[PDB]
Write a protein that binds this ligand. Sequence first.
Ligand SMILES: Nc1ncnc2c1ncn2[C@@H]1O[C@H](COP(=O)(O)OP(=O)(O)O)[C@@H](O)[C@H]1O
Lengths: 539, 124, 356, 161
Amino acid sequence: INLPKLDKYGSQNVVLFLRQLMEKQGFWKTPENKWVTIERIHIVGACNPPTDPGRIPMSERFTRHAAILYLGYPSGKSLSQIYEIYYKAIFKLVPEFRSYTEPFARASVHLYNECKARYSTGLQSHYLFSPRELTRLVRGVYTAINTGPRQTLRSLIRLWAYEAWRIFADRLVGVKEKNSFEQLLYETVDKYLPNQDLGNISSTSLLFSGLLSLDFKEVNKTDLVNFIEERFKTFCDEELEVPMVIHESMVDHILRIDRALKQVQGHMMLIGASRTGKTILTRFVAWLNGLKIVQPKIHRHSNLSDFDMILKKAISDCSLKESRTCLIIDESNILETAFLERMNTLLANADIPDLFQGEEYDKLLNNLRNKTRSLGLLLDTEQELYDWFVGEIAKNLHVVFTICDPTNNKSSAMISSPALFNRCIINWMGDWDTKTMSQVANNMVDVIPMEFTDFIVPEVNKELVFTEPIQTIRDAVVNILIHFDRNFYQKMKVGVNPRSPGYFIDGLRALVKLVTAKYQDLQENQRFVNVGLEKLNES
Amino acid sequence: LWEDVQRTFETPWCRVDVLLLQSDLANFLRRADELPRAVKQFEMYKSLFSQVNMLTSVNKILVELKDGALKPRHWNMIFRDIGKRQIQKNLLDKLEFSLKDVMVLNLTLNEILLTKIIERAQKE
Amino acid sequence: VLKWIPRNLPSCLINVESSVTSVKLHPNLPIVFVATDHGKLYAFDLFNYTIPLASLQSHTKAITSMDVLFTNYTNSSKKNYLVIVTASKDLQIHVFKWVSEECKFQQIRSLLGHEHIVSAVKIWQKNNDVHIASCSRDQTVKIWDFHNGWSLKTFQPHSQWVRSIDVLGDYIISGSHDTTLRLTHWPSGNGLSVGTGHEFPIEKVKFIHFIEDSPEIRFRTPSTDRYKNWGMQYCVSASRDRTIKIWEIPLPTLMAHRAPIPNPTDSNFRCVLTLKGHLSWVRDISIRGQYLFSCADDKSVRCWDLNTGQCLHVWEKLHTGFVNCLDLDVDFDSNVTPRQMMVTGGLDCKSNVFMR
Amino acid sequence: VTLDEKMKWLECGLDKNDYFLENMSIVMNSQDAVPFLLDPSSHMITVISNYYGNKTVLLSFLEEGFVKRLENAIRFGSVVIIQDGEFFDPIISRLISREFNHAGNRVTVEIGDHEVDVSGDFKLFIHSCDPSGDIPIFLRSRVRLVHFVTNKESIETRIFD
Ligand SMILES: Nc1ncnc2c1ncn2[C@@H]1O[C@H](COP(=O)(O)OP(=O)(O)O)[C@@H](O)[C@H]1O
């Protein structure tokens, strides 16, 4: 009710109309100029607190007539009860661990409370937690238990921690906050779970994937890395051809995108920075799971109708042909607020009620009738068909948002959007760290003219080596490149995360090409002078 | 039943509805089981039963072929390329060619060609 | 006799410089031919496998497949020898000859007709005449002639790029990237049936050939009708959906002096058994007697039973990497006697052997 | 490169200075990504046209025949210079990234709804007006930016000369 905007001189005409309805019990008919008296019609309003962005404080002349009820998030003890029921329902699958159903709920609620207390909107706009996060954690634990092997108590705790990492700590920025979450998770496990058998609990040591086997279980790091390498070679050979170096962080991001695309209704936004791999990782993960990629294409300024027909085609393929689409929505693919509204209402229930209206609605209902008859699931009423349609869209359409630096007005607007925020797994991958840059450069400097230059390995203080200790030129060149990249970014520009390394990859490619060409020229010069000397010796 | 099968097959393409056709084949399958075993052992029943299986299994491609994007030129292309025969112009432009003529196209065998043709039909 | 489960440990392990893509046994001599991802074809003797007998770098790019046929000319004018046909990613199909008296490769022809990477190659002999088939990514299956080198027939069975191929007489079954099988009469290029049901691209496709010395078997023996006259009844096709499916080929309306016409009455493959249990994509398939041997990307090899449909033995962790190929000697053929060996070339630059 | 390239650059209309020579060296040396020529003066597009002769094709983002003339020019190796870099349409986005699907005899790029071949000698350049306008992060990342703006914050070099 506080959503409508003010006028030039203040006041909202719709809110004043509501005040007229509540106080004077009537209104004036504009074109007939007559007074109408409404009988026994009640007015009920629902609004977010005024401190939320996009909320305008209404006039007290209006709220004076209504009883304001604050329906806040349920307590800190009601959540404990509710999720005790939830964990009992989950642990019906594994009754051997029935005694641990209460400590799990207590630890989940304590985790939620600590995350709310530590990370707040004062740090990032996207630090907003609610019981929805706890429900997502419960459902993720249930999905991993249902499609997993015979769970043991250590496996149960590690799985719960992995789910916690994916629900809560993915949205965190930087490394300080991630370390804070890791120590918080250690503290929660120690405080509420007397069992002490967990190894490293960090995000890089909790690798759960259903890729290497038929069960959602923990997988070895080296085996998963090799599997991803040999799958990504095939992906490049078959699909698009851009050579990409395999590094540890990309494996974790692949696992995250996989678990999101395997959800019943799972959408993700990859809010990082350009030239990181956000789109290509989504394409690769969808290729692994056999999802059809749809990337909307627009001209300089496409009307909303083009986006509407793109959405309609994607929805039809998802529902009537079970294509299991993976729609990738880039920031450039959004240029007006109508697109954002269409996305948020698509994510709202499951779909667009608007794209099907009139004759197209009749054709859609005929197609739904025939499809439901084909599956032998005949439904004789329109509501059942539309429910089946909504369910198919929910379980077949996955929307992935690719967002560059969120400092842009459109990026901040779409991140702050309520529907997209609540219905998406926010995954902050950000910019490459020192280790990822080191690995990428190391696998890119693998060229033989890197040799032949006598390298005077220096003492090189370990606090400024970043990569592994230096014993060969490769270490020197990678350290020089990464140090120059950091110096250039900290000198030319001022800010946090302007853009992920895109100059780094181009620098490495140009370095490799230039070294190869220059050493080819040097080799032919050596051959010429040596053969000339040989002929002179022959003389 | 066999007369019913033949009269269903000769039905012109413009007068068949996909939901109506599906319900009609469901009725045919229901009536088929009521036949005695002596009729079962005789070959025409097996042939018409396989025809009913054809019409039940090619439901998706029939629905995709009943979309409004397809035009008489498109059906001319389908019959010339896949059927390797040309229908008379007066009958083709009315979209009244018998469903038997569509069944002559293997549909299952040429489903990819049909799908690409209907994709171009939608894009026009 | 045919019933032979290899020992849980390989008899001998063959090390190669790079990943093995296709391994083919020698029909007469105990020689193992190994292709690599660098195109270097290797010949290895089983008793002395430390050093390759002969290595030859023909293709610039990786070899994608290899097939081996021992010529069986019925005329004494020519002498029987071995033909090794290798595909590769360089749009080439190099045909060699194995000089047994010198232990070296003698290249004969350098077939090149495909417009993009060729995936699989199959060679067979028919009444003093040798034909070579090859499916490629340009969606075309080319039937070459070994003696001359001119493509007898070329057809496009799928709109997506064909991956596997298997010939039996005058019919070709080809599994393609669009998750469909298709039986095609190659002399006329006429399609006959389409097999749908896989949800991921099809890796390897084989016919289930008819065997008669066995007492009774679920799939190898025919099912009366005119299938016995036809010669084929079933087909097996591994796929990237981690399952192996055994289909039944619908029987077309054959006619005298006429190319077989696709029967409109039945023109769809019918899945009869769906073997499940692999942990990743199934790469290769071989059938011996009653047991269906398959290799996958889970670094393991399994020995399914055709009759029951259940796995019997699993060679888990046979390779440290993926298993790209699996070879067993055919047993339906007459001149080629079934010989108890099994070779599993893998991605770990190794090629296990299961001699006994 | 040798002094032959220096005199070839100078005779096309470039200024005799270190800054512009270095920027031309950046633009010309290696083409793994499209360059973004940015300068308020329009004299540089004439320099590029003079370098390649009469085979240069002139094209702009705003005009209607954009995609059709692209599909024409790129397939037989016509150097194309885009008038406006401030604006952009993500239709050409596929070409900017090296995402050509190679084959055994050809390499193809996806533009709009057409798989159009590229000759391999095709060169793409982007020209921009004053840097007051913005460019999307996609262009700023993929495309090799280069300033040909009139000398600023240095001055010492021209007066030194
Ligand atoms: N791990 C990597 N190794 C090498 N190059 C990479 C890697 N990750 C990203 N890139 C570079 O990023 C580009 C693809 O990024 P993409 O994900 O399409 O952009 P965006 O992140 O804006 O969606 C490629 O040109 C590639 O060179």
